[PDB]
A paper describes a structure:
Retromer is a master regulator of cargo retrieval from endosomes, which is critical for many cellular processes including signaling, immunity, neuroprotection, and virus infection. The core of retromer is a trimer comprising vacuolar protein sorting (VPS) proteins VPS35, VPS26, and VPS29. Here, we elucidate the structural basis of membrane tubulation and coupled cargo recognition by metazoan and fungal retromer coats assembled with the non–Bin1/Amphiphysin/Rvs (BAR) sorting nexin SNX3 using cryo–electron tomography. The retromer core retains its arched, scaffolding structure but changes its mode of membrane recruitment when assembled with different SNX adaptors, allowing cargo recognition at subunit interfaces.
The coat consists of arch-like units formed by VPS35 homodimerization that are directly connected to membrane-attached assemblies of VPS26 dimers and two SNX3 molecules contradicting recent assertions that the VPS35 arch is incompatible with SNX3 membrane binding and that retromer:SNX3 must therefore adopt a flat structure. VPS26 forms a homodimer on the membrane by β sheet complementation between the β7 strands of the N subdomains, creating an interface identical to that seen in the retromer:SNX-BAR coat. VPS26 homodimerization is therefore not specific to interaction with a SNX-BAR layer as has been suggested. Several mutations in VPS26 (K93E and M112V/M112I) occur in sporadic and atypical Parkinson’s disease (PD) with an unknown causative mechanism. The coat assemblies described here place these mutations in close proximity to the VPS26 homodimerization interface where they will likely impair VPS26 dimerization and hence coat formation providing an explanation for the mutations’ pathophysiological effects. In the structure presented here, SNX3 binds the core trimer at the interface between VPS26 and VPS35. It is oriented with the PI(3)P-binding pocket facing the membrane and with a clear density for the PI(3)P head group present in the pocket. For both metazoan and fungal retromer:SNX3 coat reconstitutions, we included membrane-attached cargo peptides that contain a canonical Øx(L/M) sorting motif (where Ø is an aromatic amino acid and x is any residue). In the case of retromer:PX coats, membrane bending will be enhanced through a similar local membrane remodeling by the curved subcomplex of a VPS26 homodimer and two SNX3 proteins, while further membrane remodeling derives from insertion of loops from VPS26 and SNX3 into the head group layer of the membrane.
Residue numbers in the entry:
A (entry chain C), B (entry chain A): 12 to 363
C (entry chain N), D (entry chain H): 551 to 560
E (entry chain J), F (entry chain F): 8 to 301
G (entry chain L), H (entry chain G): 4 to 158
The structure:
Amino acid sequence: QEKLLDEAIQAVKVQSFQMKRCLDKNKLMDALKHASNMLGELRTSMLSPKSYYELYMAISDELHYLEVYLTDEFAKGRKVADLYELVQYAGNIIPRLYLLITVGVVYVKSFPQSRKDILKDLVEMCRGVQHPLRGLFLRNYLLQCTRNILPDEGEPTDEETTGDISDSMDFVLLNFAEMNKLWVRMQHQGHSRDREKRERERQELRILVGTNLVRLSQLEGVNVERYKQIVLTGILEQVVNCRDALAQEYLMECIIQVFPDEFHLQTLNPFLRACAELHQNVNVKNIIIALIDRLALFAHREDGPGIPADIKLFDIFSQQVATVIQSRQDMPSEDVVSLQVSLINLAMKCYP
Amino acid sequence: QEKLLDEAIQAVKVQSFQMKRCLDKNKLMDALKHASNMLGELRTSMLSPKSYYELYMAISDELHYLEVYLTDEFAKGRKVADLYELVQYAGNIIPRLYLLITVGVVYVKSFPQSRKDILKDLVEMCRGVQHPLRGLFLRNYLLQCTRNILPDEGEPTDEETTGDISDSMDFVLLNFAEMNKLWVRMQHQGHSRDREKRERERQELRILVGTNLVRLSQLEGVNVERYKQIVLTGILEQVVNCRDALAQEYLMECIIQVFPDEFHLQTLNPFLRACAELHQNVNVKNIIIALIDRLALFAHREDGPGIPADIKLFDIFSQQVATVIQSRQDMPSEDVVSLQVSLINLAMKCYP
Amino acid sequence: QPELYLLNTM
Amino acid sequence: QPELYLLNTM
Amino acid sequence: FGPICEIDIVLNDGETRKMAEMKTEDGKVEKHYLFYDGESVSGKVNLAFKQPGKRLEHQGIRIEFVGQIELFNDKSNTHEFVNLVKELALPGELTQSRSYDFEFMQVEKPYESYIGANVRLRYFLKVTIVRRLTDLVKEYDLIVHQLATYPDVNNSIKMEVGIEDCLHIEFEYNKSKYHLKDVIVGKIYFLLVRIKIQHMELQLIKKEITGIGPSTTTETETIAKYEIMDGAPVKGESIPIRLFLAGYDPTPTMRDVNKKFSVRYFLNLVLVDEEDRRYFKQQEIILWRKAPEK
Amino acid sequence: FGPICEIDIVLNDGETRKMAEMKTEDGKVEKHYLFYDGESVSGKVNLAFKQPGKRLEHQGIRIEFVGQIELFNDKSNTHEFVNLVKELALPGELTQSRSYDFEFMQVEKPYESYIGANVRLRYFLKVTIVRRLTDLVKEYDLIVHQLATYPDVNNSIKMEVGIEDCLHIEFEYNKSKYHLKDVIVGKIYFLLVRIKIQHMELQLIKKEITGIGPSTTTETETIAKYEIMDGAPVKGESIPIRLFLAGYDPTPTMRDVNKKFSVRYFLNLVLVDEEDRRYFKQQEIILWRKAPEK
Amino acid sequence: TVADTRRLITKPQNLNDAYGPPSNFLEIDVSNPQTVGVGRGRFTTYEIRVKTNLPIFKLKESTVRRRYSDFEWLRSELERESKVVVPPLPGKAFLRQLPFRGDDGIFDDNFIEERKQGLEQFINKVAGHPLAQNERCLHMFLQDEIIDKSYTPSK
Amino acid sequence: TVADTRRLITKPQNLNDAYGPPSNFLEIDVSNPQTVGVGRGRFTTYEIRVKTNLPIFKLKESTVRRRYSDFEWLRSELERESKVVVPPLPGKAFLRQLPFRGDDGIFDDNFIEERKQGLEQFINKVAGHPLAQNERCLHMFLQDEIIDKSYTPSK
């Protein structure tokens, strides 16, 4: 159809225009009424995934002018209390939650002391989320809002300001587990004949999921020991527990690519034992090859200590790939040989 | 008529029957209601002073049996307060005030602390009465009640008992002035054609008047020193100022009889200057002779100091009598000689 | 029947 | 028009 | 048959509470419970059901505390100055006996109870079982006394009155305001006596004034005749007065109660001459119920 | 001409006293003074005399404090639960303007003011100049709020409900009694889900029950619809509830006011399936006006 | 304290006032009835003897002769000016004037005696009255030897 | 404290329930319309293909052939025993049976297509209903190869 989209973007530009109009003229609740009717425009859903996405990104960009307005206002001290209650009068859950995230981040900036409490509230109340499309785009808005202000270690620690790196980690892992649940739930909603359409749409949205890991990676607090003890234990718990293949594989390559080999080296046998339990329909071969390629560029990457002698990569990887092959049932022997080729290259380049 | 009298004495005997009936059954207020009924009988005007006197003596002698009855109940510990208002319930003033006197003396015996106050009260509360006959009969009840409870030299000086000789003297001087006022008003009341009836009536009540002096004479506290300074000085001002002849003469005879020569020798001459201003119409010879007789029984009286030589009594009386005769208008010469005879007998027997 | 005369202030 | 079913206690 | 139901009220403090008496017409004396301005009235309405087998259909039961002023025995001229309601039962039935609690919190009772000639003021509890054509109603009378303290200002009455060149006197009563068991202490002083006085007496007179404006009815009643002199005075004579008010049991002075009625007391001094002519001077005194310590 | 006289009431504390608002028909909002059970009402009745030269003949002026319950806008069905009178003037005239003081001591106001569909409860001062054929009357409205403290017992509501072998849930609301600016904190826990649920919402429902016995009219009004889930849950899923009651401005729960009317609130939980069929469970909650510290 | 003995304090009575004669003395005697004239002219007069000490009466003692018509004139004057309820006279007996009765008519002794008492009754009431003593007619009657009916009523 | 963040505490969701497939699967397809008979006997049947995982349905997959009268019989049985407000059928079109119309009558394609959708509309509503799933007639219709109209309605 594609018309729905232009007509919708028209009405959107209308309400967000009258919204920003009311915000410069400094009669706030009227601006929030136009903002609310505008987000009402998001209550249509027939949009293409791409189209709906543009409307989403458009509205996010207009909301940014509001966020800086609020951030300034709070920095100016002009703060109205109890905003959540007044805003909960909006009859639908959607205005309430858009308002809660928006005001939450403003309070966190203005009240870093409130950061722990506000985050714990938001993380707990998001369990209400059950619909895939709006939930996905909301938790994306969450992920972008949470871009920088989350607790961190080299951060001033005012005992009014509560929350640490561990809290940020728990925050992102929880929102992740909920969003991945809805996203996999996307597999079975609608008629079973939209499966290729569904899987295409999810594939489109895979970046949304990986952005959580990107967010996890800028977290300065990520030491090797936190990586060892918290991150992988959480992720592998969901992975082993989800017993799906498309998501597990995407997320695991994104991990492979993203984290530094220093962390991976301390966590190889857990990561490879986890790799061995994965689903049979998985092309583990392409994963393993990518892995071999990364450790190969890591072996001949100089400006580094080289391979620690305690690190018997070949014996480790040999035994785990072997375990993976046992875990595999229908391996093309040619695939086994394609892996043997990379096994040559590794032994050749690391220990002639 | 004398019948009025008989009907009254029968109804009286009936009512005094109702007294003794109520006194038997301890119905005091029922007896006192009948006491009121007797005094209603006193509202008559037809009876003679003597007739009233006989009926009064009947009611008084029976009322004493009531008075001693009450006194005994009170002597039994059955003391009732608040008597002053209750006795005022009687419609007739006479029952109320008779009740006040009767219970008052009862309070005096039972409450010696109140004696002074109660006596001053009763003497002052007599201002209620203004009628000569009933007032007289009241004051007779007063005189018999106070015959014994008045202060004197032979009373116990009990630190609960209150009231002194000075109170008794003030009491009697007041009762004197009050009785003479009422009594003299009796002179001019009614028609002038009853001059012989009035003077006969006056003669009848004369004993009422003299009983007060009789009361003064049993008073041990009537000593010579009070008589000299205060008592006789007081009495002589009212006596000389009544400027009558019948009263002055009667009271003066009572004087002659009543006081001791102990009093007379220290007070003859003050008393004799008083004697000199008296009213013209009076027989004074009889006064003087009574005096002469008493001083004569003193001249030939043995076991006594006799006449001190410095006070030449005969020359004194001679000179005063001379002045009195000068004061007399036309007094028969035979009378002057009858006086000369006693002056002879006296000078011979007292100053041989 | 019986005469009744009010006493006046002076 | 739209069916309304009361939820029973267990 | 009889009545189907009998209403009886029983106050919670019906044992310990003090009662008081009221003189009604033909010398009758009623005795009801005593209450004071500010006190709470509370108790039980007990319905004795008399006809077993039968049923009582009603359109509601209530209890009312009522204080009102009745004029000339005229039902149309009753005026309620206090009314409080407690609904006891909704429309329904009664097969058997039942009781109902009630409490009226800290009840205002601005006036004292009074039964006069043309006026009644009474307080009562009125229980009403409402029925289709005829309500079962039960009244339950109470006495209210209004108390007061010793007055701020209390001046003696003193007055020189007379007939010109015939009689001059000076009377004095020790107060203007006397409590109900007080005493008139006074005196009569004679300044000029050119008439022949037989006797003198003090009278206590109670006027009860009813109505509004030109509509005014005064009912006078001579409560006391009290002789104070017997015989002719001369000038300079003083006659004492001591009249105990306890003897005559009067009411307090009640002035413009609800703008409806007054009850005032007067001291009428009366001298009587030899030909029975009668010279008098009236003086209002206020009476007041003294508060006993407690 | 106009009116000969205009009645105006002015309370003694008319500057400092707090006011409150009342939602009437067609969305109108009145503002009257606020009062509390036990408070004294006092002030001045000011009569503006408008026609100079003319005179106003009356048969008495009074002021009444009135609290009453009006049902179905039927004047014959009004019921006064509080009535106090202060007579201001006796029968007479008025040539010029005049004021009159009044005070009602420590006035009982047992109920809270309420304007509903078939019920009104209001307090007011009513001044009445009585005339021969037509009384000049002036009403003067007041709001009374009834306060309460934190309740002794307050148990959470928790309940396992469903359709057999189709839907089992366990809902929990954190209290039974919520103040007017309180918050419903709760959760919905799914035990068995064999239907396809589109969405779920909590509703706040206000029932107003009028009449007596079989005479019963209930007026229902759905005050809030509050979405709490969007999409299909599976078993083991918990959905959080946080509903701020401040947003909807309700009244307190008012139970058998004068045995005449109730006003009750209910939490109606509603799930809706893919074919729009609607599964629900109602739960009464008590609302109460919290007393602010002072 | 067992008895309430309260009185107000009094002024002592001056001894002249206390004993000296009272100032309310007033006695009027109607006495000595006498015929005056012969035949059809005849009428009875009485002696009205006054004794007093009230200052208002201009003679302390007086004696005058009065007719029953004079008593009617006094009563009639007092009914007009005085505003005193005046007591009754013993009565005009008209039919006693009629001739050939079984008694001496207007000069019957049981009549004249009974009338004489009634006039004494009347005059002592009237003369004792305070408002009556002001009026000129009463003094005119008691103490002027002849009444002047053509007078202007004063006081 | 600047934000009221109160929630009740929750029980962690067991990972089998969280990921494992939902227990509300039920899809019914009405498809493949076919004539059965020749001449005056002719009527259309449809394939009623069921897929589910609800325990109440005794086959997880089933396929049966149904006539529009059968759909009326199902609706009629449900109107008696069930006390479910039953949705409407797409309608008996009687006048389509009449001869010499301007269309193929009861076997018009715009008709059969539109009817086919209405039956799918109807059966998915009815079959999704909770109170309807108990009643024996619904299972009889969906999963027995022939309906036994002479039956005693149970459950």
